[PDB]
Amino acid sequence: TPQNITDLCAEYHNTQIHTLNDKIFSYTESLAGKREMAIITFKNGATFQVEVPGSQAIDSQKKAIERMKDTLRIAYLTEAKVEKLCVWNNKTPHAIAAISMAN
Amino acid sequence: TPQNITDLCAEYHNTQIHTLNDKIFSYTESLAGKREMAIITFKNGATFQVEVPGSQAIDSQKKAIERMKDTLRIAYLTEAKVEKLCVWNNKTPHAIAAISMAN
Amino acid sequence: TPQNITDLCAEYHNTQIHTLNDKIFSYTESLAGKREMAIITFKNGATFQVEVPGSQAIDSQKKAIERMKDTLRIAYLTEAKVEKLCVWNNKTPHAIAAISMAN
Amino acid sequence: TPQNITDLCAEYHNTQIHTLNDKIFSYTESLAGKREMAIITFKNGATFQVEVPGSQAIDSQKKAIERMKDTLRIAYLTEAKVEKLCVWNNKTPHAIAAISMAN
Amino acid sequence: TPQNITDLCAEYHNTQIHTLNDKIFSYTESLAGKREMAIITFKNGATFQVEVPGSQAIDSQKKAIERMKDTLRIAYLTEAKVEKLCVWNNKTPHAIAAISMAN
Ligand SMILES: OC[C@H]1O[C@@H](O)[C@H](O)[C@@H](O)[C@H]1O
Ligand SMILES: OC[C@H]1O[C@@H](O)[C@H](O)[C@@H](O)[C@H]1O
Ligand SMILES: OC[C@H]1O[C@@H](O)[C@H](O)[C@@H](O)[C@H]1O
Numbered sequence: 001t002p003q004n005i006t007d008l009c010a011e012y013h014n015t016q017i018h019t020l021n022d023k024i025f026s027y028t029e030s031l032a033g034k035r036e037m038a039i040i041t042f043k044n045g046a047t048f049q050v051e052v053p054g055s056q057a058i059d060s061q062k063k064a065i066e067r068m069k070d071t072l073r074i075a076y077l078t079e080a081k082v083e084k085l086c087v088w089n090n091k092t093p094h095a096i097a098a099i100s101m102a103n
Numbered sequence: 104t105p106q107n108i109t110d111l112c113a114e115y116h117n118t119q120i121h122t123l124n125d126k127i128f129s130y131t132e133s134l135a136g137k138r139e140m141a142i143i144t145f146k147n148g149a150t151f152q153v154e155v156p157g158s159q160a161i162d163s164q165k166k167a168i169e170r171m172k173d174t175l176r177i178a179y180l181t182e183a184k185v186e187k188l189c190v191w192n193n194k195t196p197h198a199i200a201a202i203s204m205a206n
Numbered sequence: 207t208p209q210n211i212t213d214l215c216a217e218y219h220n221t222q223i224h225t226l227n228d229k230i231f232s233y234t235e236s237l238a239g240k241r242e243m244a245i246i247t248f249k250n251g252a253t254f255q256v257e258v259p260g261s262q263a264i265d266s267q268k269k270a271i272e273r274m275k276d277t278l279r280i281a282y283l284t285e286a287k288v289e290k291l292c293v294w295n296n297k298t299p300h301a302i303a304a305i306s307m308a309n
Numbered sequence: 310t311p312q313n314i315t316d317l318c319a320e321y322h323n324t325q326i327h328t329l330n331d332k333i334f335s336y337t338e339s340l341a342g343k344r345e346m347a348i349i350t351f352k353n354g355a356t357f358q359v360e361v362p363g364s365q366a367i368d369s370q371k372k373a374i375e376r377m378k379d380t381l382r383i384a385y386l387t388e389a390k391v392e393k394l395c396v397w398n399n400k401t402p403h404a405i406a407a408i409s410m411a412n
Numbered sequence: 413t414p415q416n417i418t419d420l421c422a423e424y425h426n427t428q429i430h431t432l433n434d435k436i437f438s439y440t441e442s443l444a445g446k447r448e449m450a451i452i453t454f455k456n457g458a459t460f461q462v463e464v465p466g467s468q469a470i471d472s473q474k475k476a477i478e479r480m481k482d483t484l485r486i487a488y489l490t491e492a493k494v495e496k497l498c499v500w501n502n503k504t505p506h507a508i509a510a511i512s513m514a515n
């Protein structure tokens with residue numbers, strides 16, 4: 001079991017870590033058919049998504065995806081500093097896999 | 104995959120991108136028979152709803168609707184500035200499809 | 207579709223609007239068998255309940271009832287001003303059908 | 310229909326009202342096997358639990374149990390004054406049936 | 413029934429209490445496959461996880477796992493002082509079974 005976001009991120013193919021150390025600049029949410037998703041942006045121009053849950057994803061996956069959207073919304077609204085994001089680069093915008101917060 | 108609310112809204116028919124750059128003026132919620140709606144209003148007069156899901160709604164759609172109503176209530180309570188809304192304009196009041204928050 | 211709580215409230219029999227423009231004074235909740243209800247009070251003496259759903263209540267009603275208890279709890283804790291309540295006056299305490307919040 | 314916590318408490322056997330008029334001193338929660346419970350304490354030494362649900366417990370009661378733990382956590386975190394607690398005194402520690410919050 | 417985290421923790425083998433009396437230094441969350449988990453750390457170098465749910469986990473166990481993650485996030489964001497943690501010490505990082513929060 002990884003004990004940090006960098007090592008967790010490295011367990012997967014087509015991932016990379018972004019180190020932001022900054023609050024979220026914008027939060028976008030859609031319930032539109034086939035776009036049940038969330039997009040956040042940082043003031044440096046970086047844009048990321050929380051991907052739509054897939055065709056019958058398992059229970060743990062669907063719960064974590066909803067948890068991550070919960071987390072980004074509350075982080076944005078409270079101006080909580082985001083330390084790092086682990087994202088999949090085979091999507092556009094890059095898709096969030098994990099987030100770390102410190103400070 | 105759209106990277107912002109304007110491009111997302113343009114992927115659907117019968118939608119309008121609506122710019123606000125303002126906090127929600129009032130939040131209304133109902134639990135009454137087939138009116139389990141949320142209504143939000145803004146200072147300059149605009150009025151929007153989160154439409155009640157019908158009897159064929161799939162799980163992903165129901166979950167996203169529930170999420171949006173959560174988002175509107177917390178945005179309202181925190182006086183978070185709403186940048187834009189993407190709304191369906193063939194219903195009255197217009198029905199929210201997406202929301203962007205910034206500033 | 208109604209565009210404000212007054213007009214929504216008027217679509218039902220045995221309802222009425224109360225205009226509080228004040229924060230909630232007390233919040234009560236129970237998990238006791240058959241009384242899974244919430245009761246709120248205002249400093250002017252008014253008392254209102256969120257009625258227990260019955261054994262035939264469909265899922266969309268149940269979810270709205272739970273949402274309203276969530277809303278009342280968070281308003282109470284944050285001292286958010288309640289503008290109006292739409293209530294059924296054929297129950298005691300009067301039963302909440304809808305709520306509006308505005309500064 | 311009870312209009313307050315005291316009257317509601319009186320509808321059940323093996324209950325009593327505690328009048329704290331104080332914020333929660335400590336919040337404890339467990340996910341351990343057979344002990345999926347919450348414990349709260351006050352500065353005067355009183356200790357109460359949110360009981361583990363029974364095997365037969367129906368959905369509405371389970372939902373209310375989960376709600377009460379939500380309530381105690383946020384009451385604790387916001388230092389919200391707890392007015393009264395309705396508890397079952399045939400358990401140890403005494404188990405929460407209802408709570409009232411007021412200043 | 414245990415009346416405090418220390419006694420609760422002693423009911424299980426391979427557990428220990430950490431007395432931290434300190435806020436969480438960092439909060440990490442992941443939705444990645446096989447890694448639906450949360451990791452918290454303290455400024456003394458202690459690192460803890462909320463284990464990935466088991467594929468056959470019962471309902472009460474799954475909900476408590478979800479609740480614990482909700483608690484850790486809100487404790488983190490509000491700088492709530494964590495009093496003690498009850499952890500399974502046959503996991504690496506040590507896995508949270510119970511948390512106590514006090515002032
Ligand atoms: O679990 C979700 C992941 O699924 C992978 O197969 C895909 O490459 C990633 O982009 C991400 O979507
Ligand atoms: O939907 C709940 C409402 O249902 C009505 O039929 C009843 O008259 C009201 O008192 C309220 O209970
Ligand atoms: O509904 C929960 C309550 O159920 C009663 O039967 C029991 O006597 C109480 O101790 C409490 O467990």
Ligand SMILES: OC[C@H]1O[C@@H](O)[C@H](O)[C@@H](O)[C@H]1O
Pocket residue numbers: 341342426463500501502503507
């Ligand atoms: O219930 C969760 C616990 O399950 C036990 O079997 C295990 O030994 C502990 O380390 C922890 O995983």
